[PDB]
Every structure is written in structure tokens, then in C-alpha cells.
Amino acid sequence: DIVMTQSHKFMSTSVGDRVSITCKASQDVSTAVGWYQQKPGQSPKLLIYSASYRYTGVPDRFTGSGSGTDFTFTISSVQAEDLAVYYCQQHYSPPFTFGSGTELEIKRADAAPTVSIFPPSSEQLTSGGASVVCFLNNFYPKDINVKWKIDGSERQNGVLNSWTDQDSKDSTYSMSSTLTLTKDEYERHNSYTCEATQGTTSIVKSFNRNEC
Amino acid sequence: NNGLMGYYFTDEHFKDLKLMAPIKDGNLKFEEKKVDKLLDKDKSDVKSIRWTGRIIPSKDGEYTLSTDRDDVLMQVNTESTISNTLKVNMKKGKEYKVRIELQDKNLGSIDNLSSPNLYWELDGMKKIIPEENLFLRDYSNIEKDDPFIPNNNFFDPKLMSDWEDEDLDTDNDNIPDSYERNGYTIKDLIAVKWEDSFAEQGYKKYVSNYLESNTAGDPYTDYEKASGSFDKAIKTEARDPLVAAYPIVGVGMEKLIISTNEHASTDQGKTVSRATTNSKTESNTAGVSVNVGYQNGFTANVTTNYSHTTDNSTAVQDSNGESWNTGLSINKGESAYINANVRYYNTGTAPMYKVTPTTNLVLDGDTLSTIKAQENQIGNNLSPGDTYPKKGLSPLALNTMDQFSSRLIPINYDQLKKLDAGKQIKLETTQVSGNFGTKNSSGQIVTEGNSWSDYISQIDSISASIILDTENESYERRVTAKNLQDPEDKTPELTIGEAIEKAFGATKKDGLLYFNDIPIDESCVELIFDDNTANKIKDSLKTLSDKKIYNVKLERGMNILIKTPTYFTNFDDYNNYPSTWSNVNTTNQDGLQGSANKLNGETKIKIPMSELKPYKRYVFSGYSKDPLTSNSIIVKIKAKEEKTDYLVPEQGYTKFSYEFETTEKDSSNIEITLIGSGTTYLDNLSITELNSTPE
Amino acid sequence: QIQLVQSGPELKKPGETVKISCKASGYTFTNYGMNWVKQAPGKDLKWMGWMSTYTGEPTYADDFKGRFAFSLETSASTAYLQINNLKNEDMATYFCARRGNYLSFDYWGQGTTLTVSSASTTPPSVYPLAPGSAAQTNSMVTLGCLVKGYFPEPVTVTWNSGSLSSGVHTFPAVLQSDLYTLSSSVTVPSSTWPSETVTCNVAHPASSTKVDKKIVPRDC
Ligand SMILES: [Ca+2]
Ligand SMILES: [Ca+2]
Ligand SMILES: [Ca+2]
Ligand code: NA
């Protein structure tokens, strides 16, 4: 099966900048390469077919190049409506592999998150559950690491994480981390902490059940 | 339906019709936006106008008809006085033909035209005559004593010397002779002489016989057709006066059931049933031999048996080589009995109301029965492009027909062996009785009394037959064609290309015809003719510099079949092949059209049997050229056999064709290989299905 | 022009069967095949196979041989994708895509999401996320509401009936233990809470439920 290896999972850019995505075919596909754009919740849209042929109605800022195994897709000037995932695809022979995709993102300065931690509400405890929620708001870049610690011990199980899309105003990201326990297990620990770690910053928010 | 028909003449004497257009009401104004798209305001000067139609009042009374212009002359029923003011006693629902005439030099252009206004007064109440009371003339009612475009008018004296002059509308079909001979168009009931710029805007150029009110020989006049005033269930391509309204009812089989018991209502006995596919054209293409080379521009093929879409072939599916008789144990001299699932169709342009078809069920020449379906059991009416049962529903079982409600169709032991040998059941519809639709009163379609019988024969005597076969749908047409030997035959001359365009409503892209998204130029399809048509085309091709079959004149009696390919590539926008052609270089403008495959070495396609039908004969066609060398192109096809042929291309493009056959679904891939040498160019590679083969 | 229109979103229990349709228009249906593509929540676009609209024969990718069935209704210009004995891994968006010119996927359907869950329609529980006291980053306090245990999507979350729009982060829902959970944070000036009321408004149309949760300080 002909495999399509794409350049970068994520690419940071500015509106009006030039970006190029490369794609390496695992074997000769001649010119039978397509480039697809996919905006969240929408279907992929064919932008470039046969390596270099612009598809009908596609703006001329989108260009395609290459033959054989090395292929380039270029946005000469990135528009805000171009912030999406771009896939290369060989349409030479089945299984018509798609690249893993390249997400376009707005470049901005690094930003530490505003971390907030919330103990289980008394309502949820009355229902027998216990969720501890950590909000990591307005940080950059997207790859933030969230760690839960109970009484100094890292807690892997029961953690749900959820990232927002890039904020269209300040280009930051926000994420939510929920640690769900049973009420019985929750009332048998004292200290609950969530830690937000970036490259050079680490922020720990805590609460002790003994201190409410 | 409503309004009056305006006749706008450039001259003062109602002779040179510049524009025919309907008006809405007594204001006598047409739709100016649509007329604007068809008229040049610098060439729109008119000096006399006539409006004709019918007044139908909604209340009995003494109506005074008048016009704001004292210049205007009116008449009602060709019986009243001719005056600018008329007093008519009218009755509700009764029809009063009206003819309003205005003669005026310095009337101006059509745009600047302040047309007169038509009023009527009942009980002293004067108002513009509303649209609801104004109706166009019945243009299907050709009245010799009330011609649609009369040669005389209310204003000029009938001069003695003016005798022996030409009629404006010799056949009284409401299209002037100058229009018919030189070309016209009708859109939204607006008629005008043809201009070549109208083609860019999408208007269709109509020509018809100025001596024949019904050029196609069908129930509808040249004007009924061109204007679209006929039954709306008729296909829109039959609006062209040279494309006949012509129902073509056939039937195909999609399940064959053979039992040892003759009774339809009996659950005892051995029975074997198999699904079947069917073809409306296989009997035509199965008699086609394929040559590798084509000469003198004749890039088409000849069939020995031009069968129409009414002759339907049946292919038994999923048989696995198991004889029909193993599941029946019928012995020599005994008979099994046939039941089938069938589906009627109409590949024509017109509906068959009260469809009463007669179909022979044929096996190796033997008529096993003659199916006489009754209209009440097959949907009463069968519209063009539709089927009974309708496309989404289960097929009709023969045993539910009155004819076979008690007994089925017997089949011999020896005929069962023919079925095992691969002989196909033909459903040959030999005649279909039925009616056509004429409008009546409020626009309602009336059918009884309107027998198709005489029109079917009349149409066939002056026409050519053109069949377009796609995988999904087949289309058969009758295009009026001239007898080139008849010096008095005033049928308009069409090239085969112009006829194909009209017959199927084909569009154009870079001068080449398209049927929806399918290319149907002669270089993208398999054209199939019978022997007589092919000889005429070969002789015509020798008289042309631009040797294209589509430029050859159409002659009556010609039999033409356009088989669109299953897979095709022009190495441009179109390539619906299910696999990739290897080593394809289309960075050139050296194609038959657009780009070619500049073949430097070997180009190969591997096609799995999942992408081809089993036990079919296919033809692989294409065009090749080599401008500076005569290098042989090696063509290799691996299907049921592996065959190799050496092809010599010329400086210009020539066609090549190779037939190959598929076998079982489990067969290996079909592999087609072409080997060139640097300056070999390939274009328009097609794979076309031809016929089923024994299993 | 050419349009591929798929059937609506699907909610199915594990072990059930689902049939997705794909109606084609604007082109000769039988002249081009139909690809089927799967896109799992976090995975890349995967080709499931194609259906030849000429032969009616399906071709399946190796990972989709068994429970998957392509079928055809040429008279309706419709392709079908049926998945039998559904598993959680079958949860994805499914696209039909024309096997177009040069085998490019030149026209795509809008997609059909398939949610596999043992749950049936369940309204959410809405839990307040209050800090209580001693919490103000740059003169700002962050409140939230936790929307837990609902099915299916979607729930909409607003704050003070829309009056709080800026400073709101509603986070995408995550399906855990066959039910959905989401959270929403609002950041308001410390001068406005708890002095002025802050209320999470949760709407769950599938259960015809609206929940308004006022956020009050924790007891301590
Ligand atoms: Ca005439
Ligand atoms: Ca005529
Ligand atoms: Ca070409
Ligand atoms: Na007027």
C-alpha cells in the first residue's frame, strides 16, 4: 500500500504569510496526488488533483507541485478561512492513503494558563459521584501537559481532557481536565492538585478536603 | 395559454415578420426582458403589427370591443365587420376568434413601441381585457379559411398583379416560410429569425419544412413542437421540428422462472429461477465485427443486424454452469414452463397512452409465446424514459397478467438445452397500440381517438433512426432526414452531428457534443451503422476535407447507434477508468483534443474483474499518432486470452480497436498494455461493452 | 451542480445494524464509482472501499472486510453503506466520495456521524463549579458548570441567558462510559460575583430538558 507521509502535524502561521506542506509518497505515484482541505465539522474538499491541477473554483493562492514521490502544497498568502487541516492523498491505487494531516494555526507568543480547580459540588456528592475539574484557560501553544496528583501521587485513571479550538480573538487555547472518582474514594484522600506544565512554566493549583 | 399572439413586421404590409411574441392582456405588451435577449434594438424597427387569439367571456352580454388608437382595425370570428370598434354579443365559455391589426410607418423600434390598448365594455363598464379572457389560437387547428399568418391584411387592397406571389406561411403551421428555410428559434413562445449569437446564449436553432405543417410526420405541427405547446410529458428534445414525437415501448426481463408445472397458481413441482440482466441494444452490437484499422476517416463500425431498442436480449446470471434441466429433470419430448419478471420501458420521446404492446418471446428463432399485455395491467400509460413497474418497484411477473393467469409459457427439452448452450431469450416487441395527448380547453390532455398507428408509419418513412446507449438508459429517436435524390423534398439538410445534437438535447463544449456529462463526439464513442448507412457515410466522407462522420449529411432510412464507452479518458478533464494508467504524460497540447498521453515507453492499466462485467465482449479503442517517426506501438491485452498486436501510427491521429472478452467474476485482472517510443501520442482511450458471451 | 447527500446522524447500540445512504445528483451515477471513507474521532481519513456503480460489485479495504456491506440502488442514484454488529470502534464520521476523474475523490458527501453507545436519551446533570472564596487572578474570578451523564449530543451552554458571552469557554464534550460530559467556564469581575448572580444555562434538546444552575460560593 502506497503510504503518504506528510510534513508537519501542526504548522503555525500568520494571515498573509506563505506556508508550504510537503508530502512524501512511499513509492512512485507519478502525478496522482491530491490535496484536501477540511474545516471542523465539514467534509474534506478537493483543492488540488493530479499533483498540480487546481480544482474548480479553488483560489489561486493554493498551488500544488511535484511528481514521483515528493509533493508540495503551497498557500501563497494564508487567509483566515484557510485555517484548517490539509491532507495529501495518493489517488493512484487503493487504498488511496491520506496523509495524517497538517493543521494550520495562528502563531502568537507563549502564554501561561490561568489555572482554576474546583472540588466536587455538594450536589454531585449527594448523587454519589465526585468530579474534580481543572480549567486551563488562555494558554499557548496547544501542547500543554496536565497532571493530576492526589496526596502527592500522580493520578492517571478517571481523567477526561477537552481542548477548545484556537480562540479567534487572542489565538490562545483553553482546556478542561476532569478527574472523576466515586464519592467513597474521594472522601479517603485529603489533597487534590492539578498541574499545568509547559516548556518553562509549571502551575499547580490545589485544595485540601480537610480545609474544604 | 393565455394572452394574444403578436406578429411584428418590419414592413408596412404585414409581410416580413421580425418577431412573434405573446402579450399578456389588453395592454398588448410582451415580456420585454425575454424579447430583449433575442432582439437587437438597432434592428427592431416595425411598421405593422397583428395580434390574434381568442376572446372567451366569463359572462353572456353585449361586449363593445375598442382600441385607444383609431388607426387600429379589428375583426371577430372572421364574420364581424372590420372596424376600430366592434359590438359583439358573446356567450359564456364560447370562443370568439379576434384579429387586431395596426399599420403604421414611423411606429418605431420594438423597444420604443407604444402598442395600442384593447378594451371591452359590458353594461357601460370599460376595462382593459384581462388575461383570463384572452387565449392564444389553437395552433394545432389548421384552418384553410383562417390562416395563422394570412397573406392579406385589413389595410391594403388586394392588388391584381400581386397575384402569383409567394405565401408567407405556405403550409399554415404558423411559422413563416422564410423562418423555416433559413432558421428560427422559439423560447417562451417568442419566435424570431435565427442569429448565430443566439447559440452562445443557449437558444436552439430550429429549421423545418416550409411545405409541411408536420415536418417530422408526427401528430404535432412544427409550431406546436418548436413552441413546446404540446403535451408536457413529451421529451423536450421533441420540441425540435425535425425530432419526432415517437413512443418506443419495449420490455426487458430481469428474472426467468422455469418450472415443471404449467399452472401459475400451483406450489407443486420442481422450479428453478435465475436473475437475469437485459440489454436494449445487445442484438445490435453482437453483430459487430471489430477491425484493428480504420480507413478513409470512417472510424465507426458496421452491424449485420440493426435492431432497435424494442428488441431486448436477456443474459442469465449466477448460473455456475449448472444446466437448467438439473433442477427440473425434464426428459426428451417433455416440456417445462416459463414464468418471468419483466419491466416495460419507453426509450422514445412521447408517452404511449393506453399502452397495448405485443411482444414475442423468442429463443433461437422460436417464438415461445406472444405476450399481449393490456393497458389496465401495465400502468395504462408509459411515459418516455419511465418503466412499468416504476423504476423503484419490483418487476412485473408474467403470471399476474391475464394472458398467463391460468397457464404459463411451455418450453421444450431441446429449447432448454439451447438455454444451457448460451442462447439468449429475446423479448421482441413487434407492435404497440396506443394514443397520444392533445390539449383540450384549460390545457388538459385528451387521449382517446388519437391513435398512434398511422403516425408511427408516417414518421418512419421520412426519418433516420438514432440510438444512444448509455449504461443506465437507452434513447432511440426518429430524426427527419431528406431523401437526397428527391428534387422536391424540402426537408432541411442536417449533418449527422446536427441530428445527434437535436435528437438527444446534447450540449457543446469546445465544439464537441456532450450528453449531460458524457462526451458523445465521434472520437469518444463507438458509432455503429448498418451496411446501407455505412456505405452512404463512407461515400460522403470521401467528399469532405474535414473527414468527420458528424459532418456527413443525414439521409432518410439511415440507422445509427451511438454506444457510449464504459470507461473513457481524453487525458484532459475526463478519466472514469477504475484503475490508473501507468506512465502517463499529459503535459502537452498534442491530443486529438487538448492533451495526449505522450507515451515514451510502456503504459499499462490493470483492471480487476470487480470493475468489468462477466462473460462480455469488450472493445478497447483509442487514437494514436506519431508525427516524426512511424514507430510501431505494441498493444497487448490480457483478458480471457492474451493477444499482442503491432500498430503503426501515422502523423495524424488514426483509430485502433481491439476486442477482448471477460469470463467469470473470479477471473484474473484484465491488463491492457501499450508500448510506444518517445514521440508516440495516445488519446481517447475507451472500453466499450458489446455483447454477452456463453458461460 | 454535482451533489452527494448522505442520510442524517445515527445513534446505535453496540451489536445493532446501521445503514447509511448516499444520494448522487448532477452526474451520470453509473459512470463513476462510490468510495466510502471513515474518520474516527482522533484518527486519519481511512478508505473503507468502493462500490462500482457499473458492475454493482463492492471492493473492501482490508480493515473493513466482514461487518461492512456496500449496496446499490441505481434507479435512485443511491449508494448504501451498512455496518452490522456495531462496536465502539465504529463510532466515526462516514463519508461517501465519488470515485471521480483519475480516481480522485472529487465530490464528497456532507458526512454521517455514527455514535455507538449502550445509552439511550439521558438528560444531563448540571453541577456548579464554584471556588468559594480566595480566588481572583487579575481582578477576575472563574466559575463553571459541569454537564455530566447526558446522551446524545448536543447540549448548548450559555451564561446568564447570553448576557455573559465574552470570557466564556465551553469545552467540547467527551464520551466516557457511554455518556457525554462537558464543562463550561466563565470569567467575571470579582466585583460582580457573588454580588450579582451568575447562572449556567444548559439545554439538551434530545431530552427536551433545560437546566439553569446558579453558581453560589462554596460553604467552607
Ligand atoms: Ca410554415
Ligand atoms: Ca412547416
Ligand atoms: Ca485528449
Ligand atoms: Na398598449
PDB file of C-alpha atoms in Angstrom, chain B residues 33 50 88 111 114 119 138 168 181 211 216 273 301 348 362 399 408 417 429 497 573 580 651 684 689 691 693:
ATOM      1  CA  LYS B  33     -36.717  41.163 -20.917  1.00  0.00           C
ATOM      2  CA  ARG B  50     -51.117  41.965 -35.886  1.00  0.00           C
ATOM      3  CA  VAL B  88     -70.256  41.607 -30.242  1.00  0.00           C
ATOM      4  CA  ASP B 111     -38.483  48.809 -27.571  1.00  0.00           C
ATOM      5  CA  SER B 114     -46.270  52.338 -27.688  1.00  0.00           C
ATOM      6  CA  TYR B 119     -60.661  47.423 -24.120  1.00  0.00           C
ATOM      7  CA  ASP B 138     -55.370  26.608 -31.216  1.00  0.00           C
ATOM      8  CA  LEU B 168     -45.803  33.904 -46.092  1.00  0.00           C
ATOM      9  CA  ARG B 181     -35.989  27.710 -44.696  1.00  0.00           C
ATOM     10  CA  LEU B 211     -44.277  22.977 -47.153  1.00  0.00           C
ATOM     11  CA  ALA B 216     -41.479  15.117 -38.579  1.00  0.00           C
ATOM     12  CA  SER B 273     -35.319 -19.428 -11.123  1.00  0.00           C
ATOM     13  CA  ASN B 301     -18.304   0.087 -37.232  1.00  0.00           C
ATOM     14  CA  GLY B 348     -38.812   7.279 -27.124  1.00  0.00           C
ATOM     15  CA  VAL B 362     -38.005 -15.616 -28.821  1.00  0.00           C
ATOM     16  CA  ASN B 399     -48.208 -14.955 -14.318  1.00  0.00           C
ATOM     17  CA  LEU B 408     -47.564 -20.336 -18.409  1.00  0.00           C
ATOM     18  CA  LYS B 417     -30.565 -27.244 -23.983  1.00  0.00           C
ATOM     19  CA  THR B 429     -41.865  -6.046 -29.078  1.00  0.00           C
ATOM     20  CA  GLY B 497     -23.767  15.703 -35.900  1.00  0.00           C
ATOM     21  CA  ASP B 573     -10.810  16.505 -17.733  1.00  0.00           C
ATOM     22  CA  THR B 580      -4.634   4.163 -13.026  1.00  0.00           C
ATOM     23  CA  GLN B 651       1.448  11.661 -38.476  1.00  0.00           C
ATOM     24  CA  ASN B 684      -9.391   8.998 -26.208  1.00  0.00           C
ATOM     25  CA  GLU B 689     -19.280  -3.228 -23.835  1.00  0.00           C
ATOM     26  CA  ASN B 691     -22.400  -8.263 -26.019  1.00  0.00           C
ATOM     27  CA  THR B 693     -20.887 -14.453 -24.288  1.00  0.00           C
TER      28      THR B 693
END
